[PDB]
Amino acid sequence: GSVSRGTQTEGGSGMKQLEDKVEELLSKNYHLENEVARLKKLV
Amino acid sequence: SVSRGTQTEGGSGMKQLEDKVEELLSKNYHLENEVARLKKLV
Amino acid sequence: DRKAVIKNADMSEDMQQDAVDCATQAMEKYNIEKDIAAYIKKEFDKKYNPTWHCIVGRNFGSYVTHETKHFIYFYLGQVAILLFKSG
Amino acid sequence: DRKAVIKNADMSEDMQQDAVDCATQAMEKYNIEKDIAAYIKKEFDKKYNPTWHCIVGRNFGSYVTHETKHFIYFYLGQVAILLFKSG
């Protein structure tokens, strides 16, 4: 038996989703940190 | 007959992102708890 | 978390699941594709006789020749896995 | 922006250059790896007898078995190319 054939990957979809989610988290993060630093000073 | 393997110079930009999200998600949750913990004292 | 999607197969159903299991075991052990790739090729050489080949990755294309009922191409998560017999 | 770098080879020097030429021709014709992959496999099947296999891509790993003096792994630009014989 002898069967010739090819494959191709289709990755790349959902990247902006991630890029945008990182941006979101990075920002939420920095802002959260400042809140901590701000409250630690109080307590 | 010679068995052997290859690997490309690691790696994808998409793994980079996936791994970065994982990292941030985790740092985030932990950062939030710290806030609440101080917000619990206030 | 990384669910199995078969894109193409010319293989028995038993063998198809068995590939999907191997792939899964291999991915618990090794992070590096080259090593996942070897884990599987080796296991199939043992169970089902030589000569198998196996390519694991996310951004590749191929053209190959296989034996009847000895070919699978499937994704375990966002990672593609080509496995087949020739030799 | 697409100079030839051989990472690994067990092949004659003539054949090695000849692969590097094929790869180059294929990439003038086809943008899609699958198709570059087929172009080459086919050409080598013709010139050097079956059975060749060929994987073309950027983010993959492999484990394979080849015939003595019939294996090459090289980059044409930022794209990796595996080509080898096993039948």
Numbering used by the authors:
A (entry chain D): 130 to 172
B (entry chain C): 131 to 172
C (entry chain A), D (entry chain B): 3 to 89
Quote the study's own text.
The LC8 dynein light chain (DYNLL in mammals) is a highly conserved 10 kDa protein that was originally described as a potential cargo binding adapter of both dynein and myosin 5a motor proteins and as an inhibitor of the neuronal NO-synthase enzyme. Subsequent studies demonstrated that it binds to and regulates dozens of other proteins unrelated to the cytoskeletal motors. It is now considered to be a eukaryotic hub protein. Apo- and ligand-bound structures, determined both by X-ray diffraction and NMR spectroscopic studies, revealed that DYNLL forms a homodimer possessing two identical ligand binding sites. In the complexes two 7-residue peptides bind to parallel grooves at the edges of the dimer interface expanding the two central β-sheets.
